[model samples]
Target chain A: LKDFAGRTAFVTGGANGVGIGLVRQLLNQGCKVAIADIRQDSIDKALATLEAEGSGPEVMGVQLDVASREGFKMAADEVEARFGPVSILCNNAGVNLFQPIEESSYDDWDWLLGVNLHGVVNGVTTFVPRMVERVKAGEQKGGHVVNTASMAAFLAAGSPGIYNTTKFAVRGLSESLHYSLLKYEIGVSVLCPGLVKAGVHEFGMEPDVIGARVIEAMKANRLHIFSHPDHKEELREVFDEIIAEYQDYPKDPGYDQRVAFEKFRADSFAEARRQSR
Target chain B: FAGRTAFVTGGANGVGIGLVRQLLNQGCKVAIADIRQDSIDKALATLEAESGPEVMGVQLDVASREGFKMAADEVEARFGPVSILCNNAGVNLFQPIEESSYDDWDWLLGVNLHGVVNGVTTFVPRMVERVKAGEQKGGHVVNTASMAAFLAAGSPGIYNTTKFAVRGLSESLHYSLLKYEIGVSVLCPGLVKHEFGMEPDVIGARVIEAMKANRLHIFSHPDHKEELREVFDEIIAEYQDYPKDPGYDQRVAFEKFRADSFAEARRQSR
Candidate 1:
């Protein structure tokens, strides 16, 4: 994980917003970056700017809708042929629904989850097996994975309902990934930023600001990366409220019987967390 | 393994059925939906002694958006407007994210995650419109996530994903639906509260209690407080103290306002 140079990175939603920031930072780190965007024009423009800045032959663009499993696999083959085995994966691509959950149709729900939740799933299932094989092949060179979630995972706002859902899902997956792969020297980090100018908070941190922070977090193997420091307090309050909701009720009748049954999964999580550290 | 304590021969009790029974106990008309017809019929028979007139069973495989709409229409025609909605159908896969097949990911996500989405989209709009237009007085929604939402582990990683996603949606939807007098809650019950998926009575009762109190998070297990605290502590610790980026300070006022707004929402008697 320490050696960023000479590595290949595949970033979904790499053409714009947070993805662009991540791509730029990876390029700055001397990694061959592949920009996989749903739109080709977005990819072309990103490549044009990178090429203009002397990233020619070092950066390539592949049109990708991250929801498609076959498409992601094909894109990986293209990038690996052009660059090398992708050592870093950023499942950062996401779409937001403007309408409230009450107003959102079935189409809106599918589109958002497809790109956000399933998109992350596609990236993980597609590349992780290959990464593990390479690891087993004794190419024990370190690797890292970054999945971008958001503060919305904690403080779920009114609009972009399903977007919050997907982001939270990513965070959970990233957390489990962190503990599961830490022993293999594969660091997993989840980006949970409050606002990165491309969206709102007129004075929000720019995309570039986030890009730099992400790279630093990746190098340090941070499990949960908070780009906006101000969000720290808000996150505390949300967790506090959530924790306070637990009532002091006595155990149910089957508590012991069930507690024994629950021991396997329960201890596994506790042990994984402690063991990872 | 069977000689071992692995299997709870209780075998077939479900969280959804528990929720169904509890909702009926609250004097509300209920619809019990499942992906399988045989199970739906079985459940219908099981629940018959409780309320023959108040409950209707719908065969639904929540992945289909069209099927969801049709089921919603059928339930509505049978039990006028279907004010209370409980989206509680889910299936679990116990494979690590790295080893899980694409089909493994798709199938579990479709049922566990998309099922919740289908229910929310199908019913929330109607619930909101009717409440506003005075056709219905009010409504509430309960989406069953799991302790896995917070206490995530690697083996059942995809199941944890769906539960976490469901919690996010429930919290977000609660804020949006409040003004319309619709309450939403994420029922995240631990296995002790669930009795190895055997007993739902305790969990189902607790869900109604939390809903009536208008809690956004309906936590079923009180013993989990320490574990919950540990999870959030790790989250807080993992946030590195990076050098402040340009315009980072600008978020202070914005975050404060948003925080206060959310607190106000929490304080309100929705």
Candidate 2:
């Protein structure tokens, strides 16, 4: 895997948090980096901090929002212009809203899952093929991607219900992509971080704040990208508890979680990503 | 009957080695392909006690089709026919879906799903013809699909997906070979108390532990039995609702999930 020296790496949301750390790590491994973030200030601050540490590489930043595919395309174009074609694509931009199914508005679900799941899906559908085509043409090395997910993909309790819903979808999509892409030898890794200190909380659309404004008119909804490292042990314990439960009953359980999970998941896709088109 | 012919993937240790140990003791020639040289060599030494000159060991990457074909060819040239196909290699990420890496997905699916594909496609048709022409009566293909094949448990969806795929392949092969009397059986052991499981117990103890662990074993405290009942009840309920649901949208959604699960279950059970 360390054969990535002298290669270019492109990451969305790489100006801060896990994205920034990933960028720094790639730079340490001799990768020229191109980062895309929504905020120019975050971009500038990230560059300054990395420069202060003398850890910068052939760095370029474009102010971009992953929710918009055109923005992703433009950011990717900039990365290609600056660091050459991307060999590593990291779609790490996401927001979490912890509302229950009853509390999550159509709009609330749209914004969160749009950026979290479809944002990554759009990233893969857009850049990965181009990366593969580049490798095929001998334009660059083979492409690899890491789409950031969450431990919520595994444990239902680690996140808000809606957030868990989105993360789980992302996990399924990533698993599908991982299997699909290997036929092309394009490497893929879905980042399922258990708990990371990050500023994704800021990424929320703040439906809760808006709900407060329109108290009677709007449904009370709170979008939180809250990451609690402390409850991690509990999350693992609960997951193990469920795993034990699963082995006891190899037959289909009367309360298939798949039905519950897929209702939310397929709805997220059909209503938003698939239907929107 | 397996004498001078052996086929094993993931033959380095664990169950793979155990199966290899059985074949070697029978005076069968052994050709092993494993990820590690040492694990293969350690298993190789056991083969030497009975037949010193009848074993070959090589590094194998199960995920690659070429790797499997190359290993199979090497074994055939050295030993003879590869009469036993034991696909026993597997890896676990043990991470939540969110924190999962794309690499984790690729590795798991490659070994667990496509690796089985590679094993069966490369080996079985050839063995089937051997049995067909009466050159051999029949050959066996043993795939190690965990009970997770049927149980979702805490295992990531990928694990369940791959294991289920293996299970389906095994079942379908079993069905196809019925006329020929060829054997194909998938091992859905509740919890062997091996690497994939926590601890061991007798049937009741296993069930209890399985319940405690949320597994469905007899010796263990597994509760998935209840969960399975719950899932089926839900499916049946949903199936019942599919036609009567008022809104067209809701009906479509309900019908769609049912259809997908039916296909999935059929695929896994085949």
Cα RMSDs, all models: 5.4, 18.5
Number of the predicted model whose TM-score against the real structure is largest? 1
Worst 10 residues of 2 chain B by lDDT: B237-246
Q: What is the TM-score of chain A alone in each candidate?
A: 0.92, 0.71
In order, what lDDT does every prediction score? 0.79, 0.57
Give the TM-score of candidate 1 (chain A). 0.92
Q: Which parts of model 2 have CA positions greater than 4 angstroms off?
A: A1-277, B1-4, B25-28, B46-55, B153-155, B190-238, B244-270
TM-score, each model?
A: 0.92, 0.43
Model 1 per-residue lDDT tens digits across residues A1-277: 6878999999999998899888988988999999999999999999998889888888999999998988999999999998999999999998886767888776777798789888888898888888888988987477888998888877787877878878888888888777767667788988888777733457777888888888888887877788887877768777887887888877777666766766666677788777655
Per-candidate DockQ vs. reference:
0.53, 0.02
Q: Which ten-residue region of model 1 chain A has the weakest summed lDDT?
A: A195-204
For B207-252, candidate 2 gives per-residue lDDT tens digits of 2222222221121224334544443333222111112112334333
lDDT of model 1 at position A182: 67
Q: Which candidate number would show the highest lDDT if scored against the true structure? A: 1
